[PDB]
Nucleic acid binder design. Structure first.
Ligand SMILES: [Mg+2]
Ligand SMILES: [Mg+2]
Length: 676
RNA sequence: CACCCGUGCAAAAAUGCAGGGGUCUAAAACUGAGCGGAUAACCUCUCUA
RNA sequence: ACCAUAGAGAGGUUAUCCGC
């Protein structure tokens, strides 16, 4: 709907006093198309020009298109982004005012252009998405314990030192080793057989402990490095993976090279350690997450290369600082990322562990008590993909009690189209769509056992149908609650990143570990005193805000009045509930008594509000949170004031704060009404 | 259908029209969920040889 | 109720194709 791109203007740039425009090409590559110098302009791309300027007014430039359909559109002047009807021309800056800092962090100097900032914001987007999938991976492993062992690993302690921790007397180190022995002893490692097992008739057997430790250490260090800022040389780790110890290099090699040798594509010898670590990360994820992850990298890195290449035509300085020189190979790392995407496939189960998953399969359905029928249930449950997802990211017995929430299943049955629910109902009881949904919800909640002249194949078809229904309903519900949680994981990742970036700028944000709201308070220029906010709203403060966000009476006021209600302990427990996914681990309890479900936002926040109410039952809470919890226990549905309260640490980025605090803006796929 | 920005026009302080945004948000383009057969190909399950 | 041999069926990967 943006006519500009159709007309062919790809990315408008400011470079000193001049402006450049680019056109799409053979891929996400770019060609520099037009130079503008105040009112003068001249073409650089002489042969096969893509588009031509109609007018060259300093305010805006209208351009017609000779490539493609002859759309004509107007493009705003980058040098006039923040100058107008308020220094008549200046290079624009990001909404966070972080540009001078990010540019001096990644490159050795400021440039007086706005090419470099777009590249850096793509590197920030690379880090943003790994924060989600690294925590989901750690969640998938931690769910098998159904003790912070996973939250703690570092790559400095090779296994030869972790072996020594076997013989320590300190209760911390005995707990650290005992958690490893308990992890190894868990049969649920068969869920990740492509990672934890090796093939050697042939047979697949559990990998040597040194390797399994090197896998846990790698995924844990990646998770820690994504979600937290790392001071010192620990920051460059993902960009200095060449400095990994040989055990981790060899685990990455032998985990990656196996399907490569099956196909022979780049063997583990020449492929980048970054690509190999991304392959390792993908093993813990669902195939949809794998596609989402790996394509996002291909994009980000292709954008990065396109800027690196067009910068050379201008003669701008391309060279990164010595530590970030990782990105100077982004052509190669793009080649390896597409080679990865050529063959990356979801992790298979251990072919022989079917007898182990059997009890999970019957537990998901609540079957306890011929056993031929019981095997017919198990085989088809376990081979499904829904069972893969539910058993990795949920607990079998916990899923069964979740299906008993009538409003939750009656809700998710609304997402299935009417005709498809008729296609599902026809298989179950051989007439309005909502009466189907109601009776089918009862037949999901109160499922007991199969069977609780008709042909044998017909009864087999009925059973297989009701199985695949139940698995699909729970798959959808769990997947959507996970992908909701991922947004707050990105949010707190960005809160932690931007704290460190503001510190380099010079804002006295202080230690954000003690209280997550401190970044918002610092950016608003308010100090809490006697433990509470004291400065009532004054217009004077809004003009002093650091970021371009806020700086308005309405939002500075709504942020301040929500922050006054934002109890620090509640915010920290919300943060931990997000980052560990404890809200959905305890799904059985957090979902009780829910009176209605309006959407996945109202369900996820009901879960969180219930968790926050279950805890803090003894630990005292101040009057406004006591009133929120009373409203929660009165209306049996999520209190909309409470979410806008404990989301206040994100307020320093208003767009995020707003998108997350109210349902109508949360999901781009389900737009809804905004609240004034 | 949210945030920000540039023009035009109300105006008496803020609307409205029409646009832009890799430098806003999971968010610049390149569209998704839906499922019927087909062998090519191998497993797995009950059911009786 | 055991063992591999051997019809039907019912699944999941796998390359080809048709519509909300
Ligand atoms: Mg540290
Ligand atoms: Mg972006």
């Amino acid at each position: 709907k943006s006519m500009a791109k159709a007309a062919g203007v790809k990315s408008v740039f400011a470079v000193g006093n001049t402006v450049y425009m680019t056109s799409f090409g053979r891929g996400n590559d770019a060609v520099l198309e037009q130079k503008i110098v105040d009112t003068s302009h001249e073409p650089l791309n002489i042969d096969d020009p893509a588009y031509q300027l109609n007018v060259v007014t300093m305010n805006g430039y209208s351009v017609t298109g000779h490539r493609g359909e002859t759309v004509s559109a107007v493009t705003d002047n980058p040098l006039r982004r923040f100058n107008g009807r308020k220094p008549e021309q200046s290079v624009p800056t990001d909404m966070l005012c972080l540009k001078p800092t990010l540019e001096k962090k990644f490159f050795g100097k400021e440039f007086d252009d706005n090419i470099h900032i777009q590249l850096i914001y793509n590197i920030l987007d690379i880090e943003k998405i790994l924060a989600v999938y690294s925590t989901n991976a750690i969640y998938a492993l931690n769910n098998m314990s159904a003790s912070d062992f996973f939250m703690k690993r570092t790559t400095d302690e090779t296994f030869d030192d972790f072996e020594k921790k076997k013989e320590s007397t300190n209760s911390r180190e005995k707990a650290d080793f005992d958690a490893f022995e308990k992890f190894i002893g868990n049969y649920r490692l068969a869920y990740f057989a492509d990672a934890f097992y090796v093939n050697k008739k042939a047979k697949n057997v559990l990998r040597e402990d040194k390797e399994l430790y090197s896998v846990l250490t790698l995924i844990g260090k990646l998770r820690h490095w994504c979600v937290h800022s790392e001071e010192g040389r620990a920051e460059f780790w993902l960009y200095k993976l060449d400095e990994l110890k040989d055990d981790f290099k060899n685990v990455l090699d032998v985990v990656y090279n196996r399907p490569v040798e099956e196909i022979n594509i780049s063997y583990a010898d020449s492929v980048s350690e970054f690509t190999k670590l991304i392959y390792l990360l993908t093993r813990f994820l669902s195939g949809k997450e794998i596609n989402d992850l790996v394509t996002t990298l291909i994009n980000k890195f292709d954008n990065i290369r396109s800027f690196l290449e067009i910068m050379d035509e201008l003669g701008l300085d391309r060279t990164f600082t010595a530590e970030y020189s990782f990105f100077e190979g982004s052509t190669k790392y793009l080649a390896e990322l597409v080679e990865l995407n050529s063959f990356v496939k979801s992790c298979s189960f251990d072919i022989n562990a079917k007898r182990t998953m059997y009890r999970d399969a019957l537990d998901i359905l609540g079957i306890e008590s011929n056993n031929g029928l019981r095997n017919f249930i198990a085989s088809n449950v376990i081979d499904s993909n829904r069972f893969k997802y539910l058993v990795r990211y949920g607990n079998p017995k916990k899923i069964r009690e979740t299906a008993k929430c009538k409003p939750a299943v009656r809700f998710v049955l609304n997402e299935i189209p009417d005709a498809q629910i008729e296609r599902y109902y026809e298989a179950c009881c051989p007439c309005s769509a909502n009466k189907r949904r109601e009776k089918l919800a009862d037949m999901i909640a109160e499922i007991k056992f199969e069977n609780f002249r008709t042909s044998e194949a017909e009864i087999k078809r009925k059973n297989q149908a009701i199985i695949r229904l139940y698995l699909t309903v729970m798959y959808i519900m769990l997947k959507n609650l996970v992908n909701v949680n991922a947004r707050y994981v990105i949010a707190f990742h960005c809160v932690e990143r931007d704290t460190k970036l503001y510190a380099e700028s010079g804002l006295e944000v202080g230690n954000i570990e003690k209280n997550k709201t401190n970044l918002t308070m610092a950016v608003m220029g308010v100090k809490l005193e006697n433990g509470i906010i004291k400065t009532e709203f004054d217009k004077s403060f809004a003009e002093n805000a650091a970021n371009r966000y806020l700086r308005n009476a309405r939002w500075y006021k709504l942020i301040l009045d929500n922050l006054k209600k934002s109890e620090r302990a509640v915010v920290n427990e919300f943060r931990n509930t997000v980052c560990h996914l404890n809200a959905i681990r305890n799904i059985n309890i957090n979902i009780k008594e829910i009176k209605e479900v309006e959407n996945y936002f109202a369900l996820y926040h009901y879960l969180i509000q219930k968790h926050l109410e279950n805890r803090f039952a003894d630990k005292k809470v101040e009057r406004d949170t006591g009133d929120f919890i009373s409203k929660l226990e009165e209306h049996k549905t999520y209190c909309k004031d409470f979410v806008k309260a404990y989301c206040t640490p994100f307020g320093y980025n208003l767009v995020r704060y707003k998108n997350l605090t109210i349902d109508g803006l949360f999901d781009k796929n389900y737009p809804g009404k905004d609240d004034s």
